[PDB]
Amino acid sequence: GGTILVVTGTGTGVGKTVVCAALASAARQAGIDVAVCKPVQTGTARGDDDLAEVGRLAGVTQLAGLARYPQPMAPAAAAEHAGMALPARDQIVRLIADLDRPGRLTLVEGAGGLLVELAEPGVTLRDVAVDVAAAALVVVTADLGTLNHTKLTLEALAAQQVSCAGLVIGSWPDPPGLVAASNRSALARIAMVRAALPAGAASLDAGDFAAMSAAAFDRNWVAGLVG
Amino acid sequence: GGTILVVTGTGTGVGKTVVCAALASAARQAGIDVAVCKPVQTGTARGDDDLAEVGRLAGVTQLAGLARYPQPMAPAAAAEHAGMALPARDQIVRLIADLDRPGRLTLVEGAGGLLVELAEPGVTLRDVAVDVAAAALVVVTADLGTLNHTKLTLEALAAQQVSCAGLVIGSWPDPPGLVAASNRSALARIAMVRAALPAGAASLDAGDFAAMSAAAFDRNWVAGLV
Ligand SMILES: O=C(O)Cc1ccc(C(=O)[C@@H]2CCC[C@H]2C(C(=O)O)C(=O)O)cc1
Ligand SMILES: O=C(O)Cc1ccc(C(=O)[C@@H]2CCC[C@H]2C(C(=O)O)C(=O)O)cc1
């Protein structure tokens, strides 16, 4: 197969979706075939659709989903409120494996944070990464409190020997304050920061978003993701 | 000795200080001698002295601390901005051990979340809990995202065999709402929910805060702490 990369975050609303679109756009511009997967999507009644947003920002047409739940809550609670059930652990893995192909970068965007239950009992994106032997890209913020959450997430990855592909700051302000600048330097000592997307990147058009994506990441790292 | 409880949280601004005061007030009314220790404190330029708030809200007099930084940043960052290093690991452990005495409940409030550096090099409240053989009370919120942060914190505690004394919701909204009501049920499935302090409890006068605290916690669990 190719390269599978789960994209998680320190929590919800930290920029998982825009980072998936940014990395997808950068990989596409490098000639890499890209598929984006969102196996569990909640909040569809509120209009949330991360796959649709990734295709809007990065032009990705190879988009794969599985479970969709109306309420903007945890998958376990959103499924319970709709009378539905969570998908099986093997259903999520099968969805990802069918996308895997040589020369392709497959991004698997989680729901919420790393330890969110995606399947019963207590199956998380961390367990999924072990099943498909994928490294983990962790989206973080630059705000107060990000250092604790980033350390907690990377320690959880190491507990199951899930490699950390690095960090991405979901929103980087201009200009940065004392806290944001201090956080970015401290985050760089925790792990390698692959990119810091400028604030409001999700509001850019396709042209501006592609230029931002190509400049946000190191092309040597993006090209090295897929052989 | 007595009972040492470190009081951490899933992050910053989750209610660690008001929970320390609430548990201190409930334990005092149960006849338990209470000491509160905030070894490292930041953001004092804004005027936040967490020990002073604990003394005003719960009436605790044994209030111990080692360092106060004015900048509202992480202890390591605020220390670097002021050009002054953090306390030593032995300073924090020995201060807490000297506070501990039979019949006393000693609460150790951390700065920020569990894995925040409180002493060089990279010493956290989790390391301190191991040295003083203390269990951990985890302050959580009721908002969206608390489930992942709580699970991450509890896993970090278990990774160092630090026992979890339960959870406390730092601010219970009114009206709760769908997410908050669902989170409270899910949090109880993860760990024991010792209390959920009502929103705005940090602004109560000393008398009103004492009445809230006595009703927020189970009187039998508080009495069994020492
Ligand atoms: O996780 C991170 O990014 C690192 C980090 C570490 C510590 C804090 C704090 O300590 C806050 C800062 C301002 C006041 C402090 C607050 C209080 O004293 O009321 C608390 O204890 O949480 C915030 C962030
Ligand atoms: O940790 C917790 O308390 C549990 C938890 C679990 C999942 C979510 C989500 O999935 C959010 C809900 C609404 C939109 C979702 C968002 C997106 O779809 O873009 C995301 O994935 O973060 C939020 C909280």
Curated annotation (Swiss-Prot), chain B:
Q: In which pathway does it act?
A: Cofactor biosynthesis; biotin biosynthesis; biotin from 7,8-diaminononanoate: step 1/2
Q: Does the keyword Heme apply?
A: no
Q: Name one GO molecular function term.
A: ATP binding
Query: Which residues hold ATP?
Result: 50
Is Glycoprotein one of the keywords? no
Query: How is the cofactor bound, in the record's words?
Result: Binds 1 Mg(2+) per subunit.
> Which residues participate in substrate binding?
38-42, 145-148
One GO cellular component term noted in the UniProt record for this chain: cytosol
User: How is the enzymatic or functional activity of this protein modulated?
Assistant: Inhibited by ADP.
Per UniProt, the enzyme's principal EC class comes to ligase
Subcellular localization is given as: Cytoplasm
What cofactors does this protein use?
A: Mg(2+)
Query: What effect is documented for mutating residue 170 to N?
Result: Decreases affinity for NaHCO(3) 3-fold, for CTP 1.8-fold and for GTP 3.8-fold
Q: Name one GO biological process term.
A: biotin biosynthetic process
What is written about domains in the entry's comments? Answer: While ADP, ATP, ITP, TTP and UTP can be crystallized in the enzyme in approximately the same place as CTP, it is their phosphate tails that anchor them to the enzyme, their nucleoside moieties do not bind in the same way CTP does.
Cite the PANTHER family for this sequence.
DETHIOBIOTIN SYNTHETASE
Its name, as the record gives it, is: Dethiobiotin synthetase BioD
Q: Which organism is it from?
A: Mycobacterium tuberculosis (strain ATCC 25618 / H37Rv)
Q: Which gene encodes it?
A: bioD
